[PDB]
């Protein structure tokens, strides 16, 4: 386009400026009054209380045949499971290892007997079942089953009685007032029930005729034919079987909280009314408010503190022995999300129930954010401090150089072509507007003062007004730049968009701007942004795949069996 030229008038001493005083450098007081220590994290215990028991029952089967012409149809098979009474358990089973053949029990509010094979009773020996792998023991008496035929046209009736003992795996959930066996039998009693030491307080539904409690009861092991060690044993007579399990006190068996993950090195920060238990090995951060948390608010939380002290004293021995020293007794905090953080502080040598969430990835994020947010803020503080220190040192360069070339330096500051002067200790400026069009610019030929040979000009004369050229398209109205007229005078001058070369105070040629090579005072810095992402809902297993691991589904089986008569029988028609 058209080249731009600037005209600087004689400066008026009106406008006056000075260089701003050095700014004070801000100090980001970053740093946290922290406290390191040892921590053990507990979670809600959801698993059922598992213990082992023993069922004692006989097995009464009444079969009714019908001897036909040439066959034998069974018209009835009534099967039942009756309990072995505890007088027979302690006197026949555990003394000798036998069981009687007579089955004495109670059905329909009457007292009923039944005989194996309708013979006289015998004490038949208990025999181990053939599938006794370890994990499921049993002992029966009779591999057979009795029924008879009789004469044709008639009925008969047999009865098989088979004493049965099984080891089971009983199982009970909170609040521990019923326990179900491994044979599908609910027992409506707490496993901790008993008649001594306050255990009668526990829940029951059976009448008290049925419960029987022993002490020092040496139970016979039916395999080795020996007696076990003495222990206190309960016995309960259900309408179908007899449970016997060794009594154990509630306080040392169940526990609301179970250990999740011990941590050798935490750091306890302090925010506004919150603590932060940054666990840098687990990459996890828990947050608790600044109070303690008394675990006596929680049902069954009496295994947490004492178990925690046994663990922390291991760690303080085996790792922090010489390095640190303790700072008082352990402290209990309720972490956000349902975690319980037992925390023992250190120092260098210098009621209800807690519900725990099923995912800790809220807390890995809290660490991952805080590990970045601490590190980014520290580096961004170090830029701003070193930026402020740079500019303050840079100011002395500016103020040191303004007596050399005042106009060009002030022009860079004010973003505007001005013409400054130094009036002592200040800067007095004056604007330089553009020169408009319709003006003939005539470059001269010689830089020599006419007549005076030894005196010559410094920058070329121009013919607008008969003035001379300035610098950066400034146009001096006068012709005052003179110098001694020195040989080997080889100069260039910026003019429009062409460097005009002079040799020996005479014109030679011109040359374009981009013909002249460049050196770069700029220092590069290629900072590049971050890209946008979309995190998809990646799920390792669907909910359908998490319900598809069992061998049977109870609701699925019952939707098929309970329409059996609808599918295979016409239930609507009646017969008159």
């Amino acid at each position, epitope marked *: 386009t058209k080249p731009t030229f600037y005209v600087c008038p004689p400066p008026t001493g009106s406008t006056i400026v000075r260089l701003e005083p050095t700014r004070t450098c801000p100090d980001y007081h970053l740093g946290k009054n922290f406290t390191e220590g040892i921590a053990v994290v507990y979670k809600e215990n959801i698993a059922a209380y598992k213990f082992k028991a023993t069922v004692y029952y006989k097995d009464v089967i009444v079969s009714t045949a019908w001897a036909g012409s040439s066959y034998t149809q069974i018209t009835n098979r009534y099967a039942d499971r009756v309990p072995i009474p*505890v007088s027979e358990i302690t006197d026949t089973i555990d003394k000798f290892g036998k069981c009687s053949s007579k089955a004495t029990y109670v059905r329909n509010n009457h007292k009923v007997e039944a005989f194996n094979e309708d013979k006289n009773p015998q004490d038949m020996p208990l025999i181990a079942s053939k599938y006794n792998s370890v994990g499921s023991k049993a002992w029966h008496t009779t591999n057979d089953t009795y029924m008879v035929a009789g004469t044709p046209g008639t009925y008969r009736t047999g009865t098989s009685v088979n004493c049965i003992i099984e080891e089971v795996e009983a199982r009970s959930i909170f609040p521990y007032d019923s326990f179900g066996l491994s044979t599908g039998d609910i027992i409506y009693m707490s496993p901790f029930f008993g*008649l001594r030491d*306050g255990a009668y307080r526990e829940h029951s539904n059976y009448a008290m005729d049925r419960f029987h409690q022993f*002490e*020092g009861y040496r139970q016979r092991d039916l395999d080795t034919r020996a007696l076990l060690e003495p222990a206190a044993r309960n016995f309960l007579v259900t309408p179908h079987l007899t449970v016997g399990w060794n009594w154990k006190p509630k306080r040392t068996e169940v526990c609301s909280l179970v250990k999740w993950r011990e941590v050798e090195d935490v750091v306890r920060d302090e925010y506004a009314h919150n603590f932060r238990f940054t666990m840098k090995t687990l990459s996890t951060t828990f947050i608790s408010e600044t109070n303690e948390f008394n675990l006596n608010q929680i049902h069954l939380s009496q295994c947490v503190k004492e178990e925690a002290r046994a663990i922390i004293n291991r760690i303080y021995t085996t790792r922090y022995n010489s390095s640190h020293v303790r700072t008082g007794d352990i402290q209990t905090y309720l972490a956000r999300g349902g975690f319980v953080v037992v925390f023992q502080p250190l120092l260098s040598n210098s009621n209800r129930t807690i519900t725990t969430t099923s995912s800790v990835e809220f807390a890995m994020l809290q660490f991952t954010y805080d590990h970045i947010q601490e590190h980014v803020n520290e580096m961004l503080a170090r830029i701003s401090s070193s930026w402020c220190q740079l500019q303050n040192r840079e100011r002395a360069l500016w103020s040191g150089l303004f007596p050399i070339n005042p106009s060009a330096l002030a022009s860079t500051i004010l973003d505007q072509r001005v013409k400054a002067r130094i009036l002592g200790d200040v800067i007095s400026v004056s604007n330089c507007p553009e020169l408009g069009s319709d003006t003939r610019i005539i470059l001269q030929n010689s830089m020599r003062v006419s007549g005076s040979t030894t005196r010559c000009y410094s920058r070329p004369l121009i013919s607008i007004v008969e003035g001379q050229l300035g610098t950066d398209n400034e146009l001096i109205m006068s012709r005052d730049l003179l110098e001694p007229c020195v040989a080997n005078h080889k100069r260039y001058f910026l003019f429009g968009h062409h460097y005009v070369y002079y040799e020996d105070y005479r014109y030679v040629r011109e040359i374009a701007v981009h013909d002249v090579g460049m050196i770069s005072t700029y220092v590069d810095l290629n900072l590049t942004l971050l890209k946008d992402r979309e995190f998809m809902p990646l799920q390792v297993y669907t909910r359908d795949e998490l319900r598809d691991t069992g061998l049977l589904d109870y609701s699925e089986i019952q939707r098929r069996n309970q329409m059996h008569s609808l599918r295979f029988y016409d239930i609507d028609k009646v017969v008159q």
Partner: antibody
Amino acid sequence: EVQLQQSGPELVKPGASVKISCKASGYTFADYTMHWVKQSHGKSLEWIGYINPYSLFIDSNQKFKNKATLTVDNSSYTAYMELRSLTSEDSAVYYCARFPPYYGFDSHFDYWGQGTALTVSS
Amino acid sequence: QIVLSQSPAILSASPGEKVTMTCRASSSVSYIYWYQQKPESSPKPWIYATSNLASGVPGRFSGSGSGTSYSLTISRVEAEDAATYYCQQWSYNPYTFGGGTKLEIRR
């Protein structure tokens, strides 16, 4: 019927020992726990301890944890209570009482001895 | 050391009426019992399981209560009852008998 013969009266110097028997008759002896109490002269009743005649299991009141010891003759079906390190304050009518092995609600001291009487003086 | 206080120390009673006795427990007990003793004699098993009358006692007797309070009322007091009624428990080791009461006729 059920009868608990007992060793009868006894006078003893202090520091000595005694051995009071409670002979039983009328039931199968081996499956009934045999307890012991102390009734002082006009004072109340105090439990001592018992012994299971089958499994030789023993409880005792810890206030009487050193005064008494208990054993059972398997043959003649008696229960002996031997007292070591006597004092004057043991001048008291004692008893023995039958009790079931199971702690059920049907378990009480259903048969008592006639009551031996022991005095400690010179 | 579960102390059992049979509140009434000596319960006087004109023969024919009803009376009452209390056995007060420090902590709770599942089952309090009762035993009487005529003087210069052995005690007798009198009430087991806090309401069951023993085998061979008159039906005029009645024991009740639960928890820490336990009662004993005679429906019609008789002069053949001048006993020493103890209350008894085995729920806590050691078994502990009551202080005892002592009936009185009015004649």
